[PDB]
Amino acid sequence: QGTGCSVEIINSNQVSVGSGCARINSVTNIGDNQGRRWGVLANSSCGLSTTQNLPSGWSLRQTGFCNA
Amino acid sequence: GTGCSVEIINSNQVSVGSGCARINSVTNIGDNQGRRWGVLANSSCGLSTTQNLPSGWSLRQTGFCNA
């Protein structure tokens, strides 16, 4: 297994605009392609959320375990 | 969809790096050991590297991305 969850930030056209390894039980700083920085929370099930609301129609996706 | 989302996968099937590989280009993607890998991507999101990956490692495409 991994110390984190691989995260993609998905825009409203279902295209990824940023990615990184979100450490489990932490907030990880992950950017999008507009330069915005997101604080991504991850839990041990690789459920994911952000400290601020994503843009309307955007989403987060976890693609598997990662090591940061 | 200017690129392919790429993950670098180690020999235990854990991701050790990710990024957006521009289609029909080489894009450097880092791993978690501070190394850079030059990833080729095509319009079907086939992926390869300009240097040999560590034994047991592989690349995974996870859809389209915009750089």
Side-chain angles (χ1 to χ4, degrees):
Chain A
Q1 81 157 111
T3 57
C5 312
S6 293
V7 174
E8 298 177 322
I9 306 171
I10 306 302
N11 73 9
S12 66
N13 287 323
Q14 302 307 117
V15 175
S16 177
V17 295
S19 74
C21 183
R23 189 177 309 269
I24 287 166
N25 293 327
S26 199
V27 174
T28 302
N29 188 333
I30 302 180
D32 71 25
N33 67 357
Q34 293 171 47
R36 294 180 297 194
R37 305 308 300 190
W38 296 97
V40 177
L41 289 75
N43 61 41
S44 64
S45 304
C46 290
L48 306 170
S49 66
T50 46
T51 59
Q52 294 188 133
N53 295 327
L54 284 169
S56 192
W58 286 35
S59 58
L60 301 176
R61 185 176 293 170
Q62 83 89 10
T63 65
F65 282 123
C66 60
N67 288 334
Chain B
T2 62
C4 298
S5 294
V6 177
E7 295 178 17
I8 303 177
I9 308 303
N10 73 9
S11 69
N12 303 127
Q13 311 323 117
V14 177
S15 178
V16 298
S18 71
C20 184
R22 182 186 168 69
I23 285 166
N24 293 329
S25 192
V26 183
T27 305
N28 283 319
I29 307 287
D31 70 23
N32 67 356
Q33 291 179 43
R35 305 178 302 194
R36 320 294 302 175
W37 299 99
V39 173
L40 290 80
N42 58 45
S43 63
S44 306
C45 289
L47 304 167
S48 63
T49 49
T50 61
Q51 301 295 340
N52 279 352
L53 283 170
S55 187
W57 291 30
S58 60
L59 299 174
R60 185 176 283 178
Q61 71 98 0
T62 61
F64 293 103
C65 57
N66 288 156

